Design a binder for this molecule. Sequence first.
Ligand SMILES: *[C@@H]1O[C@H](CO)[C@@H](O[C@@H]2O[C@H](CO)[C@@H](O[C@@H]3O[C@H](CO)[C@@H](O)[C@H](O[C@H]4O[C@H](CO)[C@@H](O)[C@H](O)[C@@H]4O)[C@@H]3O)[C@H](O)[C@H]2NC(C)=O)[C@H](O)[C@H]1NC(C)=O
Ligand SMILES: *[C@@H]1O[C@H](CO)[C@@H](O[C@@H]2O[C@H](CO)[C@@H](O[C@@H]3O[C@H](CO)[C@@H](O)[C@H](O[C@H]4O[C@H](CO)[C@@H](O)[C@H](O)[C@@H]4O)[C@@H]3O)[C@H](O)[C@H]2NC(C)=O)[C@H](O)[C@H]1NC(C)=O
Ligand SMILES: *[C@@H]1O[C@H](CO)[C@@H](O[C@@H]2O[C@H](CO)[C@@H](O[C@@H]3O[C@H](CO)[C@@H](O)[C@H](O)[C@@H]3O)[C@H](O)[C@H]2NC(C)=O)[C@H](O)[C@H]1NC(C)=O
Ligand SMILES: *[C@@H]1O[C@H](CO)[C@@H](O[C@@H]2O[C@H](CO)[C@@H](O[C@@H]3O[C@H](CO)[C@@H](O)[C@H](O)[C@@H]3O)[C@H](O)[C@H]2NC(C)=O)[C@H](O)[C@H]1NC(C)=O
Ligand SMILES: *[C@@H]1O[C@H](CO)[C@@H](O[C@@H]2O[C@H](CO)[C@@H](O[C@@H]3O[C@H](CO)[C@@H](O)[C@H](O)[C@@H]3O)[C@H](O)[C@H]2NC(C)=O)[C@H](O)[C@H]1NC(C)=O
Ligand SMILES: *[C@@H]1O[C@H](CO)[C@@H](O[C@@H]2O[C@H](CO)[C@@H](O)[C@H](O)[C@H]2NC(C)=O)[C@H](O)[C@H]1NC(C)=O
Ligand SMILES: *[C@@H]1O[C@H](CO)[C@@H](O[C@@H]2O[C@H](CO)[C@@H](O)[C@H](O)[C@H]2NC(C)=O)[C@H](O)[C@H]1NC(C)=O
Ligand SMILES: *[C@@H]1O[C@H](CO)[C@@H](O[C@@H]2O[C@H](CO)[C@@H](O)[C@H](O)[C@H]2NC(C)=O)[C@H](O)[C@H]1NC(C)=O
Ligand code: NAG
Ligand code: NAG
Ligand code: NAG
Ligand code: NAG
Ligand code: NAG
Ligand code: NAG
Ligand code: NAG
Ligand code: NAG
Ligand code: NAG
Ligand code: NAG
Ligand code: NAG
Ligand code: NAG
Ligand code: NAG
Ligand code: NAG
Ligand code: NAG
Lengths: 126, 126, 126, 449, 110
Amino acid sequence: VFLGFLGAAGSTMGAASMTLTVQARNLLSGTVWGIKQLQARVLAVERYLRDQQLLGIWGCSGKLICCTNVPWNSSWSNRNLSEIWDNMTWLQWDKEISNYTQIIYGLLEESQNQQEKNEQDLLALD
Amino acid sequence: VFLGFLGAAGSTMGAASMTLTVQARNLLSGTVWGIKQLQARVLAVERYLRDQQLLGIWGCSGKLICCTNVPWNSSWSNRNLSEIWDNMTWLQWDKEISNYTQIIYGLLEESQNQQEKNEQDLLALD
Amino acid sequence: VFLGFLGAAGSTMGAASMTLTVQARNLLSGTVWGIKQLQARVLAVERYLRDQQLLGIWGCSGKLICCTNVPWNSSWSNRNLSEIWDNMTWLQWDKEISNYTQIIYGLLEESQNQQEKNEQDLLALD
Amino acid sequence: NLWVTVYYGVPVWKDAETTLFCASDAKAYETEKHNVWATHACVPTDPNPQEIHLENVTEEFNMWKNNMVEQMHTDIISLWDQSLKPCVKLTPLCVTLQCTNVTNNITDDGELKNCSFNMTTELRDKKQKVYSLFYRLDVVQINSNKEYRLINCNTSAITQACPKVSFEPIPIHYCAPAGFAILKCKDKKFNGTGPCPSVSTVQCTHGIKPVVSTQLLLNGSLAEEEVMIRSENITNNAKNILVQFNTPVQINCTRPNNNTRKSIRIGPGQAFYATGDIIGDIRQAHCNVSKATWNETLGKVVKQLRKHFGNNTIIRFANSSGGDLEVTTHSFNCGGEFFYCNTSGLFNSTWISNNDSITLPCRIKQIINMWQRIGQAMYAPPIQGVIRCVSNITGLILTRDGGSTNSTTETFRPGGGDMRDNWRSELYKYKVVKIEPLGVAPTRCKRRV
Amino acid sequence: SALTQPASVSGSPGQSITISCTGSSRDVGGFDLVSWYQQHPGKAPKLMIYEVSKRPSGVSNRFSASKSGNTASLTISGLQAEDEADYYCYSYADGVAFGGGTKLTVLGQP
Ligand SMILES: *[C@@H]1O[C@H](CO)[C@@H](O[C@@H]2O[C@H](CO)[C@@H](O[C@@H]3O[C@H](CO)[C@@H](O)[C@H](O[C@H]4O[C@H](CO)[C@@H](O)[C@H](O)[C@@H]4O)[C@@H]3O)[C@H](O)[C@H]2NC(C)=O)[C@H](O)[C@H]1NC(C)=O
Ligand SMILES: *[C@@H]1O[C@H](CO)[C@@H](O[C@@H]2O[C@H](CO)[C@@H](O[C@@H]3O[C@H](CO)[C@@H](O)[C@H](O[C@H]4O[C@H](CO)[C@@H](O)[C@H](O)[C@@H]4O)[C@@H]3O)[C@H](O)[C@H]2NC(C)=O)[C@H](O)[C@H]1NC(C)=O
Ligand SMILES: *[C@@H]1O[C@H](CO)[C@@H](O[C@@H]2O[C@H](CO)[C@@H](O[C@@H]3O[C@H](CO)[C@@H](O)[C@H](O)[C@@H]3O)[C@H](O)[C@H]2NC(C)=O)[C@H](O)[C@H]1NC(C)=O
Ligand SMILES: *[C@@H]1O[C@H](CO)[C@@H](O[C@@H]2O[C@H](CO)[C@@H](O[C@@H]3O[C@H](CO)[C@@H](O)[C@H](O)[C@@H]3O)[C@H](O)[C@H]2NC(C)=O)[C@H](O)[C@H]1NC(C)=O
Ligand SMILES: *[C@@H]1O[C@H](CO)[C@@H](O[C@@H]2O[C@H](CO)[C@@H](O[C@@H]3O[C@H](CO)[C@@H](O)[C@H](O)[C@@H]3O)[C@H](O)[C@H]2NC(C)=O)[C@H](O)[C@H]1NC(C)=O
Ligand SMILES: *[C@@H]1O[C@H](CO)[C@@H](O[C@@H]2O[C@H](CO)[C@@H](O)[C@H](O)[C@H]2NC(C)=O)[C@H](O)[C@H]1NC(C)=O
Ligand SMILES: *[C@@H]1O[C@H](CO)[C@@H](O[C@@H]2O[C@H](CO)[C@@H](O)[C@H](O)[C@H]2NC(C)=O)[C@H](O)[C@H]1NC(C)=O
Ligand SMILES: *[C@@H]1O[C@H](CO)[C@@H](O[C@@H]2O[C@H](CO)[C@@H](O)[C@H](O)[C@H]2NC(C)=O)[C@H](O)[C@H]1NC(C)=O
Ligand SMILES: *[C@@H]1O[C@H](CO)[C@@H](O)[C@H](O)[C@H]1NC(C)=O
Ligand SMILES: *[C@@H]1O[C@H](CO)[C@@H](O)[C@H](O)[C@H]1NC(C)=O
Ligand SMILES: *[C@@H]1O[C@H](CO)[C@@H](O)[C@H](O)[C@H]1NC(C)=O
Ligand SMILES: *[C@@H]1O[C@H](CO)[C@@H](O)[C@H](O)[C@H]1NC(C)=O
Ligand SMILES: *[C@@H]1O[C@H](CO)[C@@H](O)[C@H](O)[C@H]1NC(C)=O
Ligand SMILES: *[C@@H]1O[C@H](CO)[C@@H](O)[C@H](O)[C@H]1NC(C)=O
Ligand SMILES: *[C@@H]1O[C@H](CO)[C@@H](O)[C@H](O)[C@H]1NC(C)=O
Ligand SMILES: *[C@@H]1O[C@H](CO)[C@@H](O)[C@H](O)[C@H]1NC(C)=O
Ligand SMILES: *[C@@H]1O[C@H](CO)[C@@H](O)[C@H](O)[C@H]1NC(C)=O
Ligand SMILES: *[C@@H]1O[C@H](CO)[C@@H](O)[C@H](O)[C@H]1NC(C)=O
Ligand SMILES: *[C@@H]1O[C@H](CO)[C@@H](O)[C@H](O)[C@H]1NC(C)=O
Ligand SMILES: *[C@@H]1O[C@H](CO)[C@@H](O)[C@H](O)[C@H]1NC(C)=O
Ligand SMILES: *[C@@H]1O[C@H](CO)[C@@H](O)[C@H](O)[C@H]1NC(C)=O
Ligand SMILES: *[C@@H]1O[C@H](CO)[C@@H](O)[C@H](O)[C@H]1NC(C)=O
Ligand SMILES: *[C@@H]1O[C@H](CO)[C@@H](O)[C@H](O)[C@H]1NC(C)=O
């Protein structure tokens, strides 16, 4: 569905999984008191490229979807699929999991791209 | 061929399909009246990412070449391959298609990624 | 190993391939006399995009690992694999190859992406 | 067959230069004191000085071709003017001053001119007959008694540094943006300008106080377990010998007289802070230095300086030859007011083979033109009460002079008027490089189609 | 002077001569800052040679010089009547020490 930017904010994570193409397009937006717009449009592109670099150094290199080989640690809110993808929304989700995102990203990049990329290199080196 | 920036502009779309490399490398260019060079290179870093984002949101994620699954609606100047890829050039091409390109951009990302890339996930979770 | 930024700069090239992840994330780092940081952080974003654009215009489209079909020419300091990957470091490597790095990019982007993407385009033409 | 493989994120850098931003501490951020001269909106420093040490690494450092001091010097100058432009202008100040000597007895030297002059009050029509107590170095007689005027009030438009700001050098961490890294050469014995075995990739430069001291460097980093003397070219006698001390030499400077403030309105709402009557006893400024330590400190330098000139030679220390008052003397600011100390009793010795303190006569000067920016002179307002300030002498800017007739003896003299030598004594172990993560290498890897 | 020069060198136009600046191990051998001046009798000295062989723009290029270890030398090519002046050598012997000077004569008596 195309409900505008953040249109599916309050919707469940299962339904909000299809609006990802929306909240991405609106992530870039195409003297004195004019320094504001320049500084803002520089901060915007810097933040977008920071997020894109975080995404690239993971085993995704692409948008709106991603998968990997890192297992979901049972300590990190052990639940079921419907208990998360249908009982919550992204807001409550990141609120309850605003603990481990940094270490999760670190593991995702270290244990995968420093291992699976070199694995691909060595399996193609033969 | 390396014919500089826009070297094969007047060339036909078939011949100009092989010069996309030189026109992609030069899209980034590596007080008062000194703000001109600053505000310009801020416009270049943002204009380049305006296409790189759309090129990523769409079902391409690649460079200089992309194919998708959106069928070409005949209303967009239904012609033959030789009538376009050998008779027309890129300048006369968009000049006749710059009517509906806004809806072609939406179909290339909504009907493609939120359908096929999401179908790619159910192909992996089944 | 995570030895911080530029951790294994002096280590062997074979071992320095396992620390590319710490330097790939640090390449972006998340009035008067404030122009310094505003003109620097606009140089940082424009610099990283230059390397990412090169990493895109080449046949890589991928992070930290890339293999291309360009055969290694004997004129570019012909050595052996063991004589380089274990007896040299990345510091010593470019110091002797800083002759053809501009042209090495050339045949690696022209003869590869303008050919293997066109060959891939005609492979799906049927 | 061998195929070239692209590697991204490789540890590869090249010597380059860029605009290095700042980083100030947040522990003293509560001490804005209405925009202290150096740091107003400097980004907060990194809470953790994460420094990385590197092995099997060499880098050809060069403290005399370093592009960081050029960026720091022009930064300090440009940052200085932006702290004076919103201050008060004293263009109507220097009128014919009827200066007479202050109430004193014989054996004065001067050095205190009681000047009374007409001053335009708030109202343009009315005028004001007000007096002040200027120093001899600030006034010069123009040619009944004698009449004087401000020394730099031809030539240059005098500007009063509005006293809401301070001059205390607050540490500054010059940090490099993304893609650039600052290499800290952690080697002990290294006069710069050579290869460095121990190179450490540090977030950025350590806290560096922008001190202005010329000879007798103050508030500076100590040497590495031995006095470090650094010169661009030992043979070049003119090259300033940067003597980094290993042990801090105490120095106690005191403005002994108790002066008051006048804040004489020249505006509407513009007040020339002038020196009122000096309450108390009339003395002159001085700087004390433990003779036991200073003798021992200079001797430790001769033992190191004898290395670069023969196996054994006679090293002589003599007071400065001449020039402007900011080079012949020890020009520096401690308590917001600048005073110059001649330091003839500091370089007096002569070394051949192998409790008290020295008192240096100091002269105070308020009309200041540091960096020799002609056409732009600063006026330093007085400071109420005495000014006691104890610093640590950690440097020496020596210059060599010799007729070189068979090189029998050698005489070392102080100097270093240029303020870049004050920065090179801190920016010698640092250098910036841009990371080049794109790298090619041959490997049996080969992609598919 | 610390620099040892020949007293005077005589010659004829069209020919070529050589004037030497023989010094110690600290002026010509220790440093590469040898220089040569041209002082017309009664006028101000003018510089024609200032490096081992590098010279400024205002100087007959014919004038060339080099440095042989602890001995310097300046050669004069295409001698003309305008060169009737003296020439002094200058090098950095941890200071500024000039040469004794050499009066030049062309189409004239010694
Ligand atoms: C603004 O005011 C300052 C302070 O007055 C002024 O600087 C001084 O200018 C005077 C000249 O107006 C300088 O005077 C000279 O100083 C030297 C060194 O002491 C003397 O040798 C000079 O004496 C004579 O020398 C020659 C003898 O043949 C001749 O040139 C002539 O006869 C000279 O009189 C002379 O006294 C003085 O050194 C400076 N220095 C100071 C004290 O600041 C500055 O120039 C003024 N700016 C202007 C006019 O725009
Ligand atoms: C090297 O570092 C030392 C660090 O201590 C530094 O010395 C200090 O500098 C400060 C700032 O100039 C001095 O502070 C002033 O000192 C006077 C005299 O002691 C005080 O009166 C001041 O206090 C106030 O009261 C005054 C009277 O009303 C006011 O006019 C004023 O605004 C204040 O409210 C103030 O503390 C300080 O004394 C010294 N010394 C010490 C021991 O702290 C030194 O300058 C640095 N050296 C260099 C070359 O940078
Ligand atoms: C430098 O010269 C000035 C001007 O002469 C001196 O200041 C003046 O000093 C006299 C005393 O010698 C002051 O007079 C007294 O003032 C008080 C003010 O309340 C008054 O009650 C007394 O009856 C008497 O008039 C005078 O005010 C003062 N200022 C002025 C504007 O004249 C100054 O003291 C001299 N310098 C030094 C350090 O002595
Ligand atoms: C470096 O040290 C020398 C040591 O001689 C200092 O020289 C002395 O300086 C003082 C002050 O200028 C001179 O005093 C005055 O001399 C004149 C002429 O004799 C006299 O009329 C005055 O009453 C006064 O005594 C002194 O003569 C001079 N030389 C001597 C004999 O000591 C010099 O000033 C120092 N330089 C620096 C930069 O500190
Ligand atoms: C300061 O500058 C001087 C002048 O450039 C430097 O002098 C040079 O020093 C080197 C040794 O460090 C000399 O090299 C040796 O010279 C002899 C004689 O020619 C030769 O036989 C040796 O093989 C070697 O090349 C060099 O000649 C000398 N310069 C000249 C023009 O004679 C000095 O080293 C500099 N000091 C510092 C600390 O950088
Ligand atoms: C302020 O201006 C008045 C203008 O009159 C000055 O007064 C004269 O000053 C001279 C020199 O002292 C005397 O010879 C005259 O007799 C004064 N005239 C009068 C009417 O008093 C006064 O000196 C100025 N003050 C200063 C120091 O600038
Ligand atoms: C710095 O102070 C010294 C103190 O000794 C000054 O030198 C003396 O100055 C007095 C002035 O009357 C002379 O009588 C002495 O003969 C001088 N020399 C000695 C050995 O005491 C020196 O001139 C001062 N430098 C300045 C003011 O620049
Ligand atoms: C400088 O002198 C003044 C004047 O003596 C000191 O301030 C006070 O002044 C009032 C009025 O004269 C006296 O009643 C007080 O007793 C003074 N207090 C003191 C402690 O002297 C001022 O404090 C002096 N400043 C310094 C640093 O000594
Ligand atoms: C709220 O939930 C409904 C379904 O119950 C959904 O249609 C709607 O879009 C949600 N609101 C937002 C902002 O997602
Ligand atoms: C899972 O959580 C535990 C702590 O409860 C931690 O020790 C362990 O390393 C985690 N495993 C992963 C995969 O991060
Ligand atoms: C993570 O969880 C621990 C334990 O409940 C808590 O102490 C910590 O503050 C949390 N961190 C967050 C919410 O960022
Ligand atoms: C333009 O047409 C001529 C004639 O066909 C051809 O030779 C030339 O290469 C063309 N130029 C471009 C830019 O295609
Ligand atoms: C094709 O064109 C018709 C007529 O303009 C339009 O109604 C239809 O939506 C178009 N289809 C696509 C794929 O845009
Ligand atoms: C869009 O299409 C309509 C119908 O063919 C046409 O009238 C109009 O001019 C077009 N607009 C363009 C080409 O921008
Ligand atoms: C130096 O070489 C050793 C070889 O084992 C390596 O472990 C080390 O990391 C190298 N130095 C650095 C810090 O790159
Ligand atoms: C290899 O080197 C030769 C000699 O420089 C050159 O002619 C040839 O084109 C090079 N081949 C490649 C792959 O660049
Ligand atoms: C490349 O090598 C040639 C000699 O074969 C040399 O002249 C040239 O300067 C080199 N280019 C570099 C080092 O960039
Ligand atoms: C008075 O002023 C003159 C000129 O500035 C000065 O020479 C003298 O020392 C001063 N003091 C006395 C006591 O005369
Ligand atoms: C010390 O500095 C001089 C400056 O000319 C340089 O020549 C010399 O190599 C340096 N020594 C070291 C230890 O690098
Ligand atoms: C300065 O004063 C302090 C405190 O009295 C003292 O410890 C120190 O030794 C003094 N320094 C000098 C140079 O006398
Ligand atoms: C200065 O002190 C040092 C260290 O105590 C001593 O070796 C030297 O002889 C002293 N010099 C004089 C002149 O007393
Ligand atoms: C400097 O040394 C001389 C002796 O050479 C001495 O008379 C003079 O007093 C010393 N300087 C000071 C300021 O004490
Ligand atoms: C000497 O005093 C200065 C005053 O700013 C201080 O920064 C420095 O650390 C002191 N010396 C030592 C070795 O502590």
